[PDB]
C-alpha cells in the first residue's frame, strides 16, 4: 500500500524563507513562521490566507500551537519567544531569558508549559500563565535543534548539533537519558512518537532513526534523502497509512513506510530546501515549507 499525495494548494505571501509550518490541533488552521519576522495563518482545507501576526524584531525559526488551538508560541533570532492569542493576533507574553537565537519550541499537552531550545545551548521551561521561566536546563554543548514533550508531558526530548538526544524529567529537570549511536553526527531534529514509546531523530548524515526510548536502542533507519546541513522537521503520519514524513535538501518531501523503511513517495514542486513538513491531525494533508529561493508553503492531499 502507498499514499497518493498530490499538490492541492500553494501558499504564497512570505517574503523570506519559511522556517516552520504546524497544523492547529483542531485541524482548522496552519501556522507558518518565517525569516521575514512574521507568522501567517492559513485555512488548513482551502489554503486561504487568514491573517499576519507580527511583533518579533528579527526572523523566526519555529512556531507551535497550544492544545486548544487558541495560542501560538514562536521562537526568534531576537532572543525571545512570544505567546500569541491567535484570534486577535495579539502578543500576550514575551518570554525573555535566552542569550542567543531561540531555535525551537513546543507546548506540553496540558499547555500550561512551553519548552524552548536555543543557540545558547540551554533548554528552558516556561510557565504559560505567568510567562516566568521555571527551569533553565544546561542541556547541551552546542545549539539545541529540537525540543518536544511526550504524551503526558512528563518528559522532554531535546537534540543538539553536539550529537546528543537527551530526555529530561519535566518536573525535576533531571537528565534521565542520553541517546547516541556509535558515532556523533549532529542531531538536527527529534520528537516522540504519538504513543510516547519511540523517538524519531534526524542526523546530518542523511539519516532518520526510530529509537525505542525505554530500551534505548535504534530500531529502524530511513535513508535515501539529502540532509547534511539544515534542521529539517520530520513527522509520524498516522491519519491513513503509517508513514514517516520529512523534508530534504534536494527540494523534495520524502515519505517512507514506517515498518518497511522503503521510500513510498517523493513530492516534487518546491524549488529550494524543504525545511519543514507537518501532518494534519485528522485528515491526510501534509504541509511543506521551503527556504529563501522558494518562499512557498504547499498543501498536499492523499486518499490514504
Amino acid at each position: 500500500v502507498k499514499p497518493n499525495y498530490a499538490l492541492k494548494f500553494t501558499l504564497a505571501g512570505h517574503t523570506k524563507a519559511v522556517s516552520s509550518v504546524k497544523f492547529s490541533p483542531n485541524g482548522e488552521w496552519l501556522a507558518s513562521s518565517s525569516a521575514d519576522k512574521l507568522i501567517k495563518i492559513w485555512g488548513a482545507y482551502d489554503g486561504k490566507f487568514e491573517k499576519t501576526i507580527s511583533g518579533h524584531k528579527l526572523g523566526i525559526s519555529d512556531v507551535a500551537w497550544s492544545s486548544d488551538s487558541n495560542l501560538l508560541v514562536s521562537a526568534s533570532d531576537d532572543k525571545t519567544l512570544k505567546i500569541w492569542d491567535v484570534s486577535s493576533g495579539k502578543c500576550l507574553k514575551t518570554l525573555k531569558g535566552h542569550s542567543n537565537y531561540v531555535f525551537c519550541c513546543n507546548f506540553n499537552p496540558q499547555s500550561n508549559l512551553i519548552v524552548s531550545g536555543s543557540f545558547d545551548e540551554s533548554v528552558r521551561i516556561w510557565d504559560v500563565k505567568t510567562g516566568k521561566c521555571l527551569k533553565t536546563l544546561p542541556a547541551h554543548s552546542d545549539p539545541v535543534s529540537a525540543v518536544h514533550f511526550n504524551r503526558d508531558g512528563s518528559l522532554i526530548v531535546s537534540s543538539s548539533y553536539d550529537g546528543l538526544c537527551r530526555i529530561w524529567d519535566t518536573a525535576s529537570g533531571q537528565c534521565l537519558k542520553t541517546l547516541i549511536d556509535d558515532d556523533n553526527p549532529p542531531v538536527s531534529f527529534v520528537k516522540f512518537s504519538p504513543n510516547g514509546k519511540y523517538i524519531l531523530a534526524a542526523t546530518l548524515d542523511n539519516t532518520l532513526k526510530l529509537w525505542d526510548y525505554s530500551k534505548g536502542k535504534c530500531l529502524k533507519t530511513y535513508t535515501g534523502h539529502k540532509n547534511e546541513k539544515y534542521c529539517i522537521f520530520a513527522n509520524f503520519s498516522v491519519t491513513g497509512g503509517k508513514w514517516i514524513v520529512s523534508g530534504s535538501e534536494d527540494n523534495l518531501v520524502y515519505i517512507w513506510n514506517l515498518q518497511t523503511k522503503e521510500i513510498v513517495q517523493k513530492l516534487q514542486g518546491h524549488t529550494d530546501v524543504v525545511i519543514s513538513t507537518a501532518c494534519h491531525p485528522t485528515e491526510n494533508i501534509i504541509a511543506s515549507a521551503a527556504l529563501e529561493n522558494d518562499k512557498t508553503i504547499k498543501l498536499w492531499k492523499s486518499d490514504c
Partner: peptide, 12 residues
C-alpha cells in the same frame, strides 16, 4: 545577524 533572516535558514 543571520544573512537569511533566521537561524534555521542557515547552515551551522
Amino acid at each position: 545577524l543571520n544573512p537569511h533572516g533566521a537561524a534555521r535558514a542557515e547552515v551551522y
